Design a protein around this ligand. Sequence first.
Ligand SMILES: NC(=O)c1ccc[n+]([C@@H]2O[C@H](COP(=O)([O-])OP(=O)(O)OC[C@H]3O[C@@H](n4cnc5c(N)ncnc54)[C@H](O)[C@@H]3O)[C@@H](O)[C@H]2O)c1
Length: 316
Amino acid sequence: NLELRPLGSTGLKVSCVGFGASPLGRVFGPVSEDEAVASVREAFRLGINFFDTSPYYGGTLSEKMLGMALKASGVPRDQYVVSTKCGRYKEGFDFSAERVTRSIDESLERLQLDYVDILQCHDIEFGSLDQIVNETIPALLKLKQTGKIRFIGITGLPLGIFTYVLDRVPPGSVDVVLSYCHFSINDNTLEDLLPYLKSKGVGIISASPLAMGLLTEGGPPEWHPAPPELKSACQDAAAFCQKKGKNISKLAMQYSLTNKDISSVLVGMNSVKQVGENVAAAIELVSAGMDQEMLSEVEAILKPGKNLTWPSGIQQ
Ligand SMILES: NC(=O)c1ccc[n+]([C@@H]2O[C@H](COP(=O)([O-])OP(=O)(O)OC[C@H]3O[C@@H](n4cnc5c(N)ncnc54)[C@H](O)[C@@H]3O)[C@@H](O)[C@H]2O)c1
């Protein structure tokens, strides 16, 4: 019953909830292996057909667990969409043509796949954007000829990296854009970029619907780089939801799915419960709507931290 959305000009249809395999790359051994197979089986059972990973996640382990889980699924390969990344690894950054040419082979080995649907540059704000335009993207175009990848993407936090690159590449070079932390209750600045991206036929994928933990009752992690004004606004709104006996994670996830110009919202999932929670929240949004009274009250509490971002990347 999960809704599928068109992905730009790719001709692909992805589920509005995407499976982010970032948390699959933890620990090691039978435990995390049977949890990876279990969650992906649940994802397929509930209608999820979009899986995103990166060799950075788990130090290439998340790619391994995802590939084993997708292999154990028994689902035809052309009936789900796989996305992996390149350029960012546990040893650092390398967006060179040589690195990204070797990476797709290393990733496909770990994923046990013959191809990935999308290969995306991972956090280009840590590299020279001119290298991305003139070297990395022309390299991935050649990989697209080999059939090992079918669509090209770029990812990162600051929205400006999308306009900079897409202004300077030949039309059609980039097929997909992956942004994060910019379409949630506290930050919806990705809306400004949608008309720009649709004008070029680029698919739009959002991520971090909970602002990487800011919109959870447990709270943000200790390493979270949000300004203290945003973290205070988010924790007060989570307590407000807690006092009223509701879950701010559900409201934040439902909000991120209200704009169908975003083809899919990737959310990290490592448990069957997490998959069913987000899929049911998406289904509940379509069948029962959204709690407008709760959203209006949470949005007012988050006004002090509205659209507040943080520094990301290097300097150019
Ligand atoms: N964060 C980055 O640096 C980055 C950059 C580029 C791409 N991405 C892609 O985007 C995907 C999503 O990123 P995120 O995981 O950081 O999003 P997020 O932090 O907003 O929320 C998801 C996280 O909270 C927990 N959670 C999941 N479902 C929940 C529920 N129903 N109730 C309560 N808690 C729940 C999980 O630990 C998960 O990691 C990643 O998996 C990755 O594939 C991430």
